[PDB]
Amino acid sequence: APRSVDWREKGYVTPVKNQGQCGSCWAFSATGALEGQMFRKTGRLISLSEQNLVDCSGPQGNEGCNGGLMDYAFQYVQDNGGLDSEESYPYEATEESCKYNPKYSVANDTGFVDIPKQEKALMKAVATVGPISVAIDAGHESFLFYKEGIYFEPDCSSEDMDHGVLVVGYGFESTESDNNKYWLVKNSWGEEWGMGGYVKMAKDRRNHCGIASAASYPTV
Ligand SMILES: *[C@@](O)(C(=O)NCc1ccccc1)[C@H](C[C@@H]1CCCNC1=O)NC(=O)[C@H](CC1CCCCC1)NC(=O)c1cc2ccccc2o1
């Protein structure tokens, strides 16, 4: 597997969106990964509707703006057999009745794959499959002030994550070796947060913040 991977420069990731005041991080993570997979198959890069997920994934278990899984989002997409585009079903940052329109479905999936709970499997997945949906412990206020560099929270749980995000690749900082590796992760808090809306999470630090513990990607 290569030493550095970035899928943005290959056309798998869309611009960084802002999720506002609504607990839909799982939505954006799931979409992002599914956009990557749809690009891997068709070659087209279309922005997918998060509001479709927020409103219409009840039966699968998600709670709209009160949290939800990405596996449940993928299951909803498979059972509903489609997903509307962002432009057709825009994101309004509030739960509503389902307004799904099969005439505007631009993506499909056939199920999900859960990655084992070690970082090696995560790396292999990001290298071979593409952008991956993962979860991290971001409850601490230090994560709120991230700007640049590798992020390391000493009091980061490897087992209790509260935030869903999208790993788009990985690399190193070419300074003195060891504790120089990082996961490239796309947050959904806007472009003004961090590195244009991105973050560098600790990599090969024994599953820092559980980034490799709730990893999955949809099948297409
Ligand atoms: C996520 O971080 C988000 O969408 N926004 C951050 C945020 C939090 C609070 C206000 C504004 C913005 C959410 C955050 C939760 C939702 C809001 C309430 N408090 C939260 O912490 N994170 C999630 O939804 C996580 C995502 C990960 C968690 C670990 C691995 C799986 C996915 N999921 C849940 O919180 C969740 C999922 C389910 C499913 C069934 C029942 C309950 C439930 O809760």
Side-chain angles (χ1 to χ4, degrees), residues 47-108:
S47 201
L48 278 66
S49 179
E50 277 74 32
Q51 194 80 81
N52 204 228
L53 286 296
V54 166
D55 298 2
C56 309
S57 50
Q60 286 71 24
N62 310 347
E63 317 197 0
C65 286
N66 295 104
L69 283 66
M70 281 84 66
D71 289 2
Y72 286 8
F74 303 143
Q75 261 293 329
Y76 154 85
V77 177
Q78 166 178 6
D79 300 328
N80 188 37
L83 202 30
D84 294 359
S85 75
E86 181 95 5
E87 79 109 1
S88 54
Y89 199 171
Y91 174 61
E92 290 316 78
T94 178
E95 53 214 304
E96 265 165 4
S97 323
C98 191
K99 309 166 203 337
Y100 175 73
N101 200 314
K103 198 205 165 206
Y104 298 135
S105 159
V106 290
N108 297 301

